[PDB]
Amino acid sequence: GMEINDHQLSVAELEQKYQTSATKGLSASLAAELLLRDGPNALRPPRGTPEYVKFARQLAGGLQCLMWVAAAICLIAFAIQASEGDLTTDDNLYLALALIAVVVVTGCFGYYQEFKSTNIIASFKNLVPQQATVIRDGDKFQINADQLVVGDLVEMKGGDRVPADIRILQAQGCKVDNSSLTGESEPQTRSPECTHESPLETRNIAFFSTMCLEGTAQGLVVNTGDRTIIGRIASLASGVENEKTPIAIEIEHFVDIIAGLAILFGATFFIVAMCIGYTFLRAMVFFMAIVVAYVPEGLLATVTVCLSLTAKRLASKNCVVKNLEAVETLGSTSVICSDKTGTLTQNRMTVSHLWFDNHIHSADTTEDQSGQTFDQSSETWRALCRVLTLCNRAAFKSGQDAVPVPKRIVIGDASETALLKFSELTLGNAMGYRERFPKVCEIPFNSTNKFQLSIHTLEDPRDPRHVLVMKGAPERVLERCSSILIKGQELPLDEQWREAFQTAYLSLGGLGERVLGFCQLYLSEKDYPPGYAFDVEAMNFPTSGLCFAGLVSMIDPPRATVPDAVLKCRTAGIRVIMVTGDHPITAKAIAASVGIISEGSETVEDIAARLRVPVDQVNRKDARACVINGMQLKDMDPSELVEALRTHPEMVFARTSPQQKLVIVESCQRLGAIVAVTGDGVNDSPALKKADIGVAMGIAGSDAAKNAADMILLDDNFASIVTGVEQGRLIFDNLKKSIAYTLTKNIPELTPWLIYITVSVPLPLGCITILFIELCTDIFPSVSLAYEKAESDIMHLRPRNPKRDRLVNEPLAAYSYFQIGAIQSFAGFTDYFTAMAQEGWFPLLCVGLRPQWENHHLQDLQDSYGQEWTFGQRLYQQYTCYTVFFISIEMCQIADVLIRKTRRLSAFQQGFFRNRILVIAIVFQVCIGCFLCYCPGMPNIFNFMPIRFQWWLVPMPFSLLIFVYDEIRKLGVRCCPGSWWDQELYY
Amino acid sequence: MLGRTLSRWVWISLYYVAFYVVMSGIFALCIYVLMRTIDPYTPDYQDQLKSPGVTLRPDVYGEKGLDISYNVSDSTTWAGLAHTLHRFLAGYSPAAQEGSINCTSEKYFFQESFLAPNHTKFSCKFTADMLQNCSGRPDPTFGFAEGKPCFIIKMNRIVKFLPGNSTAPRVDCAFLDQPRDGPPLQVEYFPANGTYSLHYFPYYGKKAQPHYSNPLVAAKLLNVPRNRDVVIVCKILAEHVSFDNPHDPYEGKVEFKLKIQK
Numbered sequence A: 001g002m003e004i005n006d007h008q009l010s011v012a013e014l015e016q017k018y019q020t021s022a023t024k025g026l027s028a029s030l031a032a033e034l035l036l037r038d039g040p041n042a043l044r045p046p047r048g049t050p051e052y053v054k055f056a057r058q059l060a061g062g063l064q065c066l067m068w069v070a071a072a073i074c075l076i077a078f079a080i081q082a083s084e085g086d087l088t089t090d091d092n093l094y095l096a097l098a099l100i101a102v103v104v105v106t107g108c109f110g111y112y113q114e115f116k117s118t119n120i121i122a123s124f125k126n127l128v129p130q131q132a133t134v135i136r137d138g139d140k141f142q143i144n145a146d147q148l149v150v151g152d153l154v155e156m157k158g159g160d161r162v163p164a165d166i167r168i169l170q171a172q173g174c175k176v177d178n179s180s181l182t183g184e185s186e187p188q189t190r191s192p193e194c195t196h197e198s199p200l201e202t203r204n205i206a207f208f209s210t211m212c213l214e215g216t217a218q219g220l221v222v223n224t225g226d227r228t229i230i231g232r233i234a235s236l237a238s239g240v241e242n243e244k245t246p247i248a249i250e251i252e253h254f255v256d257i258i259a260g261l262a263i264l265f266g267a268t269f270f271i272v273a274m275c276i277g278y279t280f281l282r283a284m285v286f287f288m289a290i291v292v293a294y295v296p297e298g299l300l301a302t303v304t305v306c307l308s309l310t311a312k313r314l315a316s317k318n319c320v321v322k323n324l325e326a327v328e329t330l331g332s333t334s335v336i337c338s339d340k341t342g343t344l345t346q347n348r349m350t351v352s353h354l355w356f357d358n359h360i361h362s363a364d365t366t367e368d369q370s371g372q373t374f375d376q377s378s379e380t381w382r383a384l385c386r387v388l389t390l391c392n393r394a395a396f397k398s399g400q401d402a403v404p405v406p407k408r409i410v411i412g413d414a415s416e417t418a419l420l421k422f423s424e425l426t427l428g429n430a431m432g433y434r435e436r437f438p439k440v441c442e443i444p445f446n447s448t449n450k451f452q453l454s455i456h457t458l459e460d461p462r463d464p465r466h467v468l469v470m471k472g473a474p475e476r477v478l479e480r481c482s483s484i485l486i487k488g489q490e491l492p493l494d495e496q497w498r499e500a501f502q503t504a505y506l507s508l509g510g511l512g513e514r515v516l517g518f519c520q521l522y523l524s525e526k527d528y529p530p531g532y533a534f535d536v537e538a539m540n541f542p543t544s545g546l547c548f549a550g551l552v553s554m555i556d557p558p559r560a561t562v563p564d565a566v567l568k569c570r571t572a573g574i575r576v577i578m579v580t581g582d583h584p585i586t587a588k589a590i591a592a593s594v595g596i597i598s599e600g601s602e603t604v605e606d607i608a609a610r611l612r613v614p615v616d617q618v619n620r621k622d623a624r625a626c627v628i629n630g631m632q633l634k635d636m637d638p639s640e641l642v643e644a645l646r647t648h649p650e651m652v653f654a655r656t657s658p659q660q661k662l663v664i665v666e667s668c669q670r671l672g673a674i675v676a677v678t679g680d681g682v683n684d685s686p687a688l689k690k691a692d693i694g695v696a697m698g699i700a701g702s703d704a705a706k707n708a709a710d711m712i713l714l715d716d717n718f719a720s721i722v723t724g725v726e727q728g729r730l731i732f733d734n735l736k737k738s739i740a741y742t743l744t745k746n747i748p749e750l751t752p753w754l755i756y757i758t759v760s761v762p763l764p765l766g767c768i769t770i771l772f773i774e775l776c777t778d779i780f781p782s783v784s785l786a787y788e789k790a791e792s793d794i795m796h797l798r799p800r801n802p803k804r805d806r807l808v809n810e811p812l813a814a815y816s817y818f819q820i821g822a823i824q825s826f827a828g829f830t831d832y833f834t835a836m837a838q839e840g841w842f843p844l845l846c847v848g849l850r851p852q853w854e855n856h857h858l859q860d861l862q863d864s865y866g867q868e869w870t871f872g873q874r875l876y877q878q879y880t881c882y883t884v885f886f887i888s889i890e891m892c893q894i895a896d897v898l899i900r901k902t903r904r905l906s907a908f909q910q911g912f913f914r915n916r917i918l919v920i921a922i923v924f925q926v927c928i929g930c931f932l933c934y935c936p937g938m939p940n941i942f943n944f945m946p947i948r949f950q951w952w953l954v955p956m957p958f959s960l961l962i963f964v965y966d967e968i969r970k971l972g973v974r975c976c977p978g979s980w981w982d983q984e985l986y987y
Numbered sequence B: 001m002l003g004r005t006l007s008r009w010v011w012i013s014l015y016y017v018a019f020y021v022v023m024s025g026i027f028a029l030c031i032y033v034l035m036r037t038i039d040p041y042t043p044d045y046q047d048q049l050k051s052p053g054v055t056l057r058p059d060v061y062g063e064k065g066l067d068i069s070y071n072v073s074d075s076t077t078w079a080g081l082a083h084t085l086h087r088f089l090a091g092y093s094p095a096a097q098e099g100s101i102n103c104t105s106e107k108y109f110f111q112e113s114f115l116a117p118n119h120t121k122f123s124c125k126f127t128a129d130m131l132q133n134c135s136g137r138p139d140p141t142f143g144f145a146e147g148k149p150c151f152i153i154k155m156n157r158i159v160k161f162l163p164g165n166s167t168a169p170r171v172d173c174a175f176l177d178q179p180r181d182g183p184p185l186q187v188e189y190f191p192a193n194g195t196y197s198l199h200y201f202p203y204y205g206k207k208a209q210p211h212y213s214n215p216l217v218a219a220k221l222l223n224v225p226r227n228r229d230v231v232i233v234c235k236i237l238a239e240h241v242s243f244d245n246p247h248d249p250y251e252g253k254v255e256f257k258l259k260i261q262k
């Protein structure tokens, strides 16, 4: 009952169904009752969750929450420690603060990812008329559009938009634009006649928001508001549940791994702490420290900086993203569903073929005229060109000489518009040529005549003849011809010619193209003197026994770059499906033209006509291609749609409703596809909202289409999709490189605390310094891995299995966390005991030393040599410990970022230095280091110490070891691609 | 299975444990090399020991530093202060000093060969009686009973540190804030002038002078008023001792709150 049946009702029933009059409309009272029952004739705007509740969710998350807890412990500790008058550590204040900055600064990164921040129903009620004329109690007047109610009697005209979903009762030459439903701006006729089962195809339903191109009609309002077909398209778009992009899923998964590990580590040692005799309040502070050490505070930040720089790169190819997540998705996409008109095609009727001289020729239908033309040496051709040029009434608006001919705006229907553009492309200036042959007489195209004719003075001064030129439907042009132009000579139209013609006509018909015949007849001066008075109402001229010249056929042709883009995608393992509202025959022709259907693919219908067998005996597997109309789709079951998708790898869905587009996208999704969707129209918005990424054309796109998109091709260059595929596959490959590099240093920030707790050595690595490494020193190096190039031939690889190929996996985590990270902690501790001993504290003295070390009532503690030490002097030496541990990690992050440059390939072939941005990041890394060390004051602001050259050298053999270890590892997998070594130790 | 098969689990464990043994070996070796790097007698560097710390006894800490408070009228308020003072001095008894020797040079006691027993260097005696009126004899209440208490000022030792040759390093105690209503902090120091004899320097480290004992100086405060809170700063006046550091209040000086109740 959501569904319109009112097209199949009599007036008696429609009047009974609505308690209305088909000629006097609703009673004024019942109108205002019904208005209270149904509400206004308007689309309800589903409020997007308010702007700041959007920002609150960013604050939450596995990593965000641990920071909260840690900042809270820092406050609680700060309060408890200061409620006993201990003013000695405001570290637990500043630690608390910095954490909160990080939580908030991180949450800001997440929220400003969404540049667009807009609601779709805004564009939808910009498609809606503000006024309507209605009749109630037999009084016609202009009402507000929103006041209409089902049952209202409504009068439409050309120029005005249709005020509701209307069941048409009477019409006078009335045509509408249904492109918001079908994507097709071709005018459709509205009558009161019931011409189809579907109300989407019948003539006596007119649709809310569609534009009435011409004529007039009256009809009954059978739906209003969100019940109208535009209101349902809108609902489908708004009501799509907000599912997570492929990379959001990946980020969440890695975060879940980290947060789980952090709670486990923090909680087991809290126990261990309490078990070896610490006070609960101190173990609570260890839990905070372990969390702060293990969690990568800078990680999510680095990830979105990498996405930012891919978004930057895409945008320079005129490919504009609306949310940083959308910058990855085309790399993970495995099925593209594409609207045909204005996406694949130019949305412009273009001359495509010509039948003359008994042969079909192919015109160059590209927008840049970059294609293959047809032979124009023929004198049959010079003649046909004369006819299609003179017999045309369309016009270029002036001053367009700077414009490319295809872009030029012309006054005329699509057909004559195409013919005129075709003629100016073929010959210099069609309007100039036409003026040389002055139009003596003319009859425009008619419904009764079913052709268009005009007679013309000729250009030669010497030649006094009058040439008659005519076009119309080919069969009906031909039934008025007696001869035909063939190879210069003119022959009587014998049976063999008439049959030749019919096959050509039906041939171009089969290519989903519109077809026109074109004939001429030269009038002598003997029967028609130079000043003969050609009178249209007299028919004083002939309209039979003309000379046939040729057929011309036209189609909305592919955009020039679109067919190569499609092969590139398929080459990269992506399935490509056509999903259009246009008619199947055109859709299939264009699918073939563009590469969606490979040369040699047959449908089961194709096979059946070759083998001359019924289709029900064709084995469905044998057909590589398939064309399913919306009616069939409506009839199918989901198991059947799936069965079709699995069976025919080259799939065309034509004559589909907006919901049917959604249902196809979703079907692919349930099957396991990451689905992209390329469209330019209002009817695409549900399919756009529901894809994992939606791409709109920037120029020929509709607002609703651009609003529901995640990505916008600003120049309409479909080939940009191919770029997106690549950049996506790169950014994913490179993110695991930064993530691997950023995670690996977490382990040597952890282990110092684990040892400190369990061994009571002086504290090796403090929090303030970790944050410096995490949020400052290593930030640029991790980002620079974004710039890394592809190790493999990325465009020939299949799209990644979303279920088994993840951004962070156990092999990547274990190797980075427990091998490279472990080497880094052994370096740290080696430099720690090195700097302690060279300063008077032998390692055995450090075990259990912590209590006395950290005692402010102990100003003369003795070291290994017997030297007595103040708490102050000990404190600064503790800072020296923090610093050596810091620079051990930094020196290893040089080795680390180098070995992360490649996951398969050795650093000796790709080299070390081709990535320019990475080496500046390494150099900035070491500069920000020397500053923190040797800038004066640094020991008292940030706890950093001017270490000696020797302790920079100490961890270098460990860094070198890391390089050599990984290099050996990577060679192992190149030389044994199936072995255990490869299985277990490749990340 | 919890991620692999029962034989794939064993072969990764064997690798990780191998990795960990090798890395623990490399580490253990590094530490061992480090320890033959190290001379057992003189530290490699003395970066945090530019100037010696200073401590006092008895050390009683409140919050924010040394706070000492007692009632002259009640013997039990200063008992523990006496007790820690006596108990500290026990290592400075004539028998406790059996490993050190008589030093008369009043100049740096430079020793290059280890002529003392068990291949060590000689260390100079410092006996508690060198503190005279503050030695616990004849007054075992160490000045406190009479409201004129002794605090002992000890200079942290540092290997091969030499405090300056022109005279011996001296202690000076004064009030931190001279009271507008009162006179300067009047103190008598034992030994005379409050000096550390030069022959207690250099320290050569616990291994070379196991019986080494820090020279002391007592600061007998004579001026301090009853039932008022004061603050006393004792600075070491030596050429190579500094007491200006704002991040180490105990570098070259020591300060304490004092209140003498009645």
Ligand SMILES: CCCCCCCC/C=C\CCCCCCCC(=O)OC[C@H](COP(=O)(O)OCC[N+](C)(C)C)OC(=O)CCCCCCC/C=C/CCCCCCCC
Residues within 6 Å of the ligand: A751, A755, A759, A822, A825, A826, A829, A842, A843, A844, A847, B020, B024, B027, B028, B029, B031, B032, B035, B036, B038, B039, B040
């Ligand atoms: C997942 C499982 C991870 C497994 C990690 C296990 C880590 C443990 C690895 C090794 C244990 C310590 C090895 C110590 C090697 C000693 C070598 C040696 O012979 O040296 C001599 C010193 C004794 O000096 P002396 O008496 O000769 O000096 C006198 C002065 N002179 C020399 C001038 C005469 O021996 C000594 O110090 C003995 C005391 C050693 C001090 C212990 C320090 C504790 C710190 C441990 C931190 C380790 C963190 C590891 C990071 C792993 C990341 C996961």
Ligand SMILES: CCCCCCCC/C=C\CCCCCCCC(=O)OC[C@H](COP(=O)(O)OCC[N+](C)(C)C)OC(=O)CCCCCCC/C=C\CCCCCCCC
Residues within 6 Å of the ligand: A268, A271, A272, A275, A276, A277, A278, A758, A759, A760, A848, A851
């Ligand atoms: C899933 C969850 C698993 C949980 C695993 C738990 C297993 C471990 C449980 C027990 C281990 C055996 C305990 C050994 C016997 C007790 C030793 C002890 O009574 O020590 C207590 C001391 C605290 O008193 P204090 O002497 O410092 O007082 C000084 C007072 N003042 C500061 C005023 C001067 O402890 C300190 O704070 C400073 C340390 C000095 C004593 C050394 C004790 C270290 C021994 C073992 C630690 C190893 C744990 C490793 C677990 C790792 C799992 C991955």
Ligand SMILES: CCCCCCCCCCCCOCCOCCOCCOCCOCCOCCOCCOCCO
Residues within 6 Å of the ligand: A891, A894, A895, A898, A926, A934, A946, A947, A948, A949, A950, A952, A956, A959, A960, A963
């Ligand atoms: C695959 C490769 C893996 C291996 C990785 C190799 C990486 C190489 C990285 C290069 C790093 C460069 O390191 C620079 C080291 O700078 C050391 C600075 O040395 C200073 C030593 O002096 C000790 C400081 O003395 C403290 C007291 O200073 C007083 C005198 O100071 C003079 C003025 O300086 C004022 C600040 O100290």
Ligand SMILES: CC(C)CCC[C@@H](C)[C@H]1CC[C@H]2[C@@H]3CC=C4C[C@@H](O)CC[C@]4(C)[C@H]3CC[C@]12C
Residues within 6 Å of the ligand: A810, A811, A814, A815, A818, B012, B013, B016, B017, B020
């Ligand atoms: C080195 C000694 C002291 C610790 C031995 C403990 C064992 C049980 C630990 C240490 C290293 C650990 C492994 C580290 C790496 C990996 C590979 C990863 O994909 C899953 C976890 C897994 C498989 C861990 C399982 C448990 C493990 C094998």
Ligand SMILES: *[C@@H]1O[C@H](CO)[C@@H](O)[C@H](O)[C@H]1NC(C)=O
Residues within 6 Å of the ligand: B099, B117, B118
């Ligand atoms: C080393 O010499 C000292 C002298 O102070 C002596 O008391 C001690 O017994 C000696 N130790 C050994 C092991 O010979």
Ligand SMILES: *[C@@H]1O[C@H](CO)[C@@H](O)[C@H](O)[C@H]1NC(C)=O
Residues within 6 Å of the ligand: B133, B188, B220
């Ligand atoms: C130190 O003792 C001597 C000997 O009795 C005495 O005369 C002198 O006054 C005492 N000095 C102080 C400050 O008590």
Ligand SMILES: *[C@@H]1O[C@H](CO)[C@@H](O)[C@H](O)[C@H]1NC(C)=O
Residues within 6 Å of the ligand: B165, B166
């Ligand atoms: C102080 O020290 C130096 C070397 O120790 C010495 O040459 C100098 O003469 C000494 N000065 C005095 C005043 O004794």
Ligand SMILES: *[C@@H]1O[C@H](CO)[C@@H](O)[C@H](O)[C@H]1NC(C)=O
Residues within 6 Å of the ligand: B192, B193
């Ligand atoms: C140190 O005491 C002596 C007595 O031996 C005295 O002459 C001298 O004035 C005192 N020094 C100072 C700086 O007062």
Ligand SMILES: *[C@@H]1O[C@H](CO)[C@@H](O)[C@H](O)[C@H]1NC(C)=O
Residues within 6 Å of the ligand: B071, B072, B073, B074, B227, B261, B262
């Ligand atoms: C010291 O003790 C006496 C009695 O023992 C008491 O009366 C006096 O008030 C005490 N002094 C102070 C400052 O409390």
Ligand code: ALF
Residues within 6 Å of the ligand: A182, A183, A184, A339, A340, A341, A342, A343, A579, A580, A581, A582, A680, A681, A683, A684
């Ligand atoms: F342009 Al279409 F379906 F092909 F909207």
Ligand SMILES: [Mg+2]
Residues within 6 Å of the ligand: A183, A184, A339, A340, A341, A342, A343, A347, A680, A681
């Ligand atoms: Mg379209």
Ligand SMILES: [Rb+]
Residues within 6 Å of the ligand: A019
């Ligand atoms: Rb009625």
Ligand SMILES: [Rb+]
Residues within 6 Å of the ligand: A292, A293, A294, A295, A296, A297, A746, A749, A770, A774
């Ligand atoms: Rb961290």
Ligand SMILES: [Rb+]
Residues within 6 Å of the ligand: A409, A410, A411, A412, A413, A414, A417
């Ligand atoms: Rb037009």
Ligand SMILES: [Rb+]
Residues within 6 Å of the ligand: A457, A458, A459, A460, A461, A462, A463, A464, A465
């Ligand atoms: Rb003419």
Ligand SMILES: [Rb+]
Residues within 6 Å of the ligand: A688, A689, A690, A691, A692, A693, A694, A710
């Ligand atoms: Rb989407």
